[model samples]
Target: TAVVQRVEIHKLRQGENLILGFSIGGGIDQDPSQNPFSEDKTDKGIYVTRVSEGGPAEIAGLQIGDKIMQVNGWDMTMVTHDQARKRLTKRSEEVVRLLVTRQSLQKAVQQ
Candidate 1:
């Protein structure tokens, strides 16, 4: 039988910022063309592989399959995953701003 798993959610207010408790996975070397979910293979960025349940990122609406397009207004398309991580960690602010695109959201718009 197939297993089913679920996670709880925590809501945040509009003015509140997210803590972004998550980790990135995969690299730009992976051919984006091979992934049917990718919107643009020519511009590859780091992918979100996991999100800590009940963490700030989760509460802020980050998903596992979401591709990180930018962080704190910085474009990540040309940066490596490690560089992206460093940029985020090096930030002086406690709250981080992230721009991500989800596969399901893109598919919905296409249809």
Candidate 2:
């Protein structure tokens, strides 16, 4: 029913802690009125807010409005903003994998 985009991002860091160059918005703990990605007013959906230009996430095809589905093997369906932040910043992991639903991906193929 939706497009679950598989994105693999290689951490870009020659120093301590890698950067994904993407920002996330919306979570169950946040105010529903603060959601910038959804028109339906769902506060539990973690959607992409920004992706830095020419960065790992941008190069990997991650885009604005992509609802986060999973991180590695962790379920992100119903998580707090802080919890989602922690999972993405897991230590010593050089590669980051994401399962996200980007409805635009499906629309692109059909149109």
Candidate 3:
């Protein structure tokens, strides 16, 4: 019999921001008023979710699921994951611009 080894997985640290993705769906809610089936709200949207303690996001006031609409005047919609990754780094020279949209729904909606 062979022994199996286990390894622990650590979250990726993307500079001061702990970049993560959330999913949206038909059941999601675009507005905060509508409630059609438990709002489909996830961190993936233009929101920030769970800022790492002592991390850059936390210091920036980024919380769990805070809509991120723009960064440094650069619209979030125009920004890509790759571009975000490149822009948000540990380097102090980098300036981060973030505009977020916040709602109080828990369902996914069509954007």
Q: In candidate 2, which residue pairs get closer than 3 Å at backbone N, Cα or C atoms, i.e. clash?
A: none
lDDT of 2 at 5: 90
Tell me the deviation in Å of residue 1 in model 3. 58
| Poorly placed runs, candidate 3 (over 4 Å) | 1-46, 90-92, 104-111
Please give, for residues 22-81, the per-residue lDDT of candidate 2 as tens digits: 999877898767776665675577788999999899999999988888999788868889
Clashes of 2: 0
Candidate 1 ranges with C-alpha deviation above 4 Å? 1-19, 27-43, 105-111
Which one wins on TM-score? 2
Q: Which residue runs of candidate 2 sit more than 4 Å off their true CA positions?
A: 105-111
Q: Tell how far residue 62 is off in model 2, in angstroms.
A: 0.3
lDDT of 3 by residue, 1-111 (tens): 211112111224566644422222121223423323223423233334345566555555544544555555555444455555444443543445556544444457765
Query: Which is better, 1 or 2, measured by lDDT?
Result: 2
| Deviation of model 1 at 18, angstroms | 11
All candidates: CA RMSD (Å): 9.3, 2.7, 15.5
State the local distance difference test value for candidate 2.
0.84
Assess every candidate by TM-score. 0.63, 0.85, 0.44
- Candidate 1: the clashing residue pairs are none
Model 3 residue 106 distance off true place after TM-score fit, in angstroms: 15
Model 1: lowest-lDDT 10 consecutive positions: 1-10
